[PDB]
Amino acid sequence: MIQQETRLKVADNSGAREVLTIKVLGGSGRKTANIGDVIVCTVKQATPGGVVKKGEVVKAVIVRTKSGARRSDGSYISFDENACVIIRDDKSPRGTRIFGPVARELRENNFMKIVSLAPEVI
Amino acid sequence: TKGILGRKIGMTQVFAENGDLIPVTVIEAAPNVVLQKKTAENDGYEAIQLGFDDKREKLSNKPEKGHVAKAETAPKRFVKELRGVEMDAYEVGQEVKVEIFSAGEIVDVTGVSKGKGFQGAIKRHGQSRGPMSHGSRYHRRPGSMGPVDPNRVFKGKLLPGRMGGEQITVQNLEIVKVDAERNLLLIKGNVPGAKKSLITVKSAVK
Amino acid sequence: SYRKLGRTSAQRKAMLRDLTTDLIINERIETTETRAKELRSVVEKMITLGKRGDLHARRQAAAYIRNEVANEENNQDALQKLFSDIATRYEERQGGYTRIMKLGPRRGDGAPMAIIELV
Amino acid sequence: AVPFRRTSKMKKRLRRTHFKLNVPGMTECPSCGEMKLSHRVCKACGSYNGKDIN
Amino acid sequence: MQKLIEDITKEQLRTDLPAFRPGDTLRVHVKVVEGNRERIQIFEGVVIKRRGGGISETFTVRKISYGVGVERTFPVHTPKIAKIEVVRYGKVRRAKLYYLRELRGKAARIKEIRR
RNA sequence: GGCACCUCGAUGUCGGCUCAUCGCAUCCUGGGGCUGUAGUCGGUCCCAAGGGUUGGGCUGUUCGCCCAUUAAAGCGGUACGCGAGCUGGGUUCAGAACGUCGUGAGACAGUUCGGUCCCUAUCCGUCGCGGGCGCAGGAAAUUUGAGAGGAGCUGUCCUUAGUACGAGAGGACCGGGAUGGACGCACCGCUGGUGUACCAGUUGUUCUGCCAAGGGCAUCGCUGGGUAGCUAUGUGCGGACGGGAUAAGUGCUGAAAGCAUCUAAGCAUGAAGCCCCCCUCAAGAUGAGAUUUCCCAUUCCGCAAGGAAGUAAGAUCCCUGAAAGAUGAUCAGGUUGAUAGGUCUGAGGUGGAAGUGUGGCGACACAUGGAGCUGACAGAUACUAAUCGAUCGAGGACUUAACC
């Protein structure tokens, strides 16, 4: 459960390091975000050389959280931290290379592009 | 329509030949017996009232014993009735067992709820409570009564009271497996009521 | 569940330990009803423990019951008196070593007394 | 938090109509002679269920 | 109740499982289907928990992946865990080994008991 | 704003929190008319109050402005709703200061820092829960439903179909399908949380004569877990299909008034709107309903008006309890019995007990041995307690039909 205002770690080469969820999208008032959904956010700290600077509102999807994610078989997927990747509105990531393991939920949410550039999918 | 009455023994999960995991509700139902066939021309409507499980002769009294002696069975502890059934389908004194249901059928379920007792408004109706700090002496109080001009509080301002014990119906449940050998039922989902209690199961009106 | 006896866990545990030691001391207790009801089960698991009667059993029962004098001329402490005499007496009855006799309540507060004896 | 009017006599009695306390339940003792509660040992004869208790 | 539960779930609980303690390390095969293309993703890791009973028995397993530790959970008796085998026998003390999430990198040693 | 009509032997004044409720002059969702409405979008107007109508930054602020979402971020009334419910930031005390005014004490709908918010609920009213009585005998169950409540909200994607329309751009109506947001209901198998008589490690001190092994206290001494029960952030489901009568609207036929004309006579269609369909309560519904089953119409007195005194069916007192519980109540039980506690077997949890022996100077590690322990959990077991008792509780008026 990623929540409004939660600070997130970034896992791509877009140059953002810490981002800040503006709030989540979907319904009018969505109190929660689990794995897979786009969240609009601002970037709190960033690399010097990067496509995104410090402090602009961007759109992103969380790709791994520490709270569990439930699959229909009975398994759960969970991690040690929270991470997201910046997506421009073409529904494909802004960075060209991402890091670390990524969940399978971004398959059935139509995200083959970031799924392919993922270094590893569990 | 069709339906049976049973006793809720428990609930667990069962795999269904595909990899997904399916929590299930376990209900044992000894074969019920129709005791009376309520008909329209005297009762004002048609129904069948049926009994579920037995009693000892100590707890059996003479009036209900005479009532049961028409169908010539053991005395029945648990008796309920259903409406909308096929009138000529059931002869009085016949059984209903568990096999009239088949796996995959949508099902209306109805049972008494778990009793909880005198709980406050916070538990009872789930409206939020006041601040826990910044000087608040309004920790868990049930909200203002109402306006001033009507000079009284309206009916139905929702106040602390007893919970539970009031029968509730869950709609469109799906029976995943029936075990006629042990007289067991196994419905996906979660079924209301405490353990070893009443539970009645109906074919869904939807 | 199990009763609270109007006190928290420390002096509650001390209370039950003290009463069961008293039970083994004089085989007959006068006390109130609810103390008797929660007394029965615990003294009878110590009775099962003494029936077991091995060294692990000795140390386990030592960890709960306390050391009073029970037969002073033989200097018999409560542990050894239990573990020798009462286990040998009641080894055969596989449960139910306790009886409750209810009485009229006290003058002071109307608290319902009960008679506890080991039999 | 104050009584706005005095409570009249019939109101007072009408409230107190339930504050009467019930009789206990007596039963004739196993040992002869006297009255005893149910499920209590005998105060006078000192007996219960026919058995004697000191 | 638990009698009737285990008789109703005996036919579904699995049997081919080597008995394992929750301080050991395993590899588990899952038969995940992606695009109707059935394939096996192996998962190497260390048990962190073993909880439940009957077929409510479940266990879970940790792995460090690309500098990120991952939890993987399963019910014990799913049909779609294809193959499981022990690679190495661990020596621990706790029943539930929860602190491994904090302990990251080498200092998560699991000793080989060789038993 | 004007007037001063109740209140100065006190009617607490802004805003916020908790809680709603009503109106419609409708913000969205529903149905339509006109369009300077091609289509995607709109503008206005009409019918429509069923439901919904977001989180932040700033200021005490309502109000505003801004950021980001949403279908939409409605307007108002209820002592500018709601202080014997809460808040005290500001105004509205006593201290102190600044600017200004005054010779001065002092003053400013000028500012700034600080500044005691009492009440054990009597009666209505509200939410639950009991006792009595009534329902022309006395009981155990099952019901009918007058009549009350609640839910009654919506998006996105796929297809129809890049199809109608459009030089083009762009892009449908209607109809199917999948999935979600928010609410509500229910419930612990799963994810977890709690879990203070469960288990394990551990410091200080003290105690059990000493070692070992334990006890007490130190927030449950601390720390890691954890059964039942309760629980959400966890799981399952709902708001579907329909019917009837309609609103705005669209009509068919047709005169008054040879035509015309949805109109007066007739016949239709037509909404998230009304009544049902869904869920719950419900015969105190004094109009006290209905069904089935059992008990029978005894003993006395004034003989009779009618009483009293034992009873039947069936209950109660009392006792063991919980799935119920503030107590009442409900439900499971009370010796032909599994109700509760033991005992035994388990699940599950903690996890390698003591005591031995080995290795080691040693702290320690090994085998004995998934050992030892186990609150609520589930099966058996008459071991202990539900014993002897007692109390209450029927005997039934006029007429029409009908037959002893």
Automatic annotation (TrEMBL), chain A:
GO terms for cellular component: cytosolic large ribosomal subunit. Keywords: Ribonucleoprotein, Ribosomal protein, RNA-binding, rRNA-binding. GO terms for molecular function: large ribosomal subunit rRNA binding; structural constituent of ribosome. CDD domains: Ribosomal_uL14 (cd00337). Pfam families: Ribosomal_L14. It comes from the Bacteria. Belongs to the universal ribosomal protein uL14 family. This is Large ribosomal subunit protein uL14. Part of the 50S ribosomal subunit. Forms a cluster with proteins L3 and L19. In the 70S ribosome, L14 and L19 interact and together make contacts with the 16S rRNA in bridges B5 and B8.
TrEMBL record, chain B:
InterPro entries: Ribosomal_uL3 (IPR000597), Ribosomal_uL3_bac/org-type (IPR019927), Ribosomal_uL3_CS (IPR019926), Transl_B-barrel_sf (IPR009000). PANTHER family: 50S RIBOSOMAL PROTEIN L3 (PTHR11229), LARGE RIBOSOMAL SUBUNIT PROTEIN UL3C (PTHR11229:SF16). One of its GO terms (molecular function) is rRNA binding. Belongs to the universal ribosomal protein uL3 family. The keyword Oxidoreductase does not apply. The gene is rplC. Part of the 50S ribosomal subunit. Forms a cluster with proteins L14 and L19. GO terms for cellular component: cytosolic large ribosomal subunit. One of the primary rRNA binding proteins, it binds directly near the 3'-end of the 23S rRNA, where it nucleates assembly of the 50S subunit. NCBIfam families: L3_bact (TIGR03625). The keyword Nucleus does not apply. It comes from Bacillus subtilis. Residues 121-151 are annotated as: Disordered. It holds the Pfam family Ribosomal_L3. GO terms for biological process: translation. Keywords: Ribonucleoprotein, Ribosomal protein, RNA-binding, rRNA-binding. This is Large ribosomal subunit protein uL3.
Automatic annotation (TrEMBL), chain C:
It comes from the Bacteria. InterPro entries: Ribosomal_bL17, Ribosomal_bL17_CS, Ribosomal_bL17_sf. GO terms for biological process: translation. The keyword Oxidoreductase does not apply. GO terms for molecular function: structural constituent of ribosome. Pfam families: Ribosomal_L17. One of its GO terms (cellular component) is cytosolic large ribosomal subunit. Keywords: Ribonucleoprotein, Ribosomal protein. The keyword Ribonucleoprotein applies. Part of the 50S ribosomal subunit. Contacts protein L32. Belongs to the bacterial ribosomal protein bL17 family. This is Large ribosomal subunit protein bL17. It comes from Bacillus subtilis. The lineage of its organism: Bacteria, Bacillati, Bacillota, Bacilli, Bacillales.
UniProtKB/TrEMBL annotation, chain E:
GO terms for cellular component: cytosolic large ribosomal subunit. InterPro entries: Ribosomal_bL19 (IPR001857), Ribosomal_bL19_CS (IPR018257), Ribosomal_bL19_sf (IPR038657), Translation_prot_SH3-like_sf (IPR008991). Pfam families: Ribosomal_L19 (PF01245). GO terms for biological process: translation. The keyword Transcription regulation does not apply. One of its GO terms (molecular function) is structural constituent of ribosome. This protein is located at the 30S-50S ribosomal subunit interface and may play a role in the structure and function of the aminoacyl-tRNA binding site. Belongs to the bacterial ribosomal protein bL19 family. This is Large ribosomal subunit protein bL19. The lineage of its organism: Bacteria, Bacillati, Bacillota, Bacilli, Bacillales.
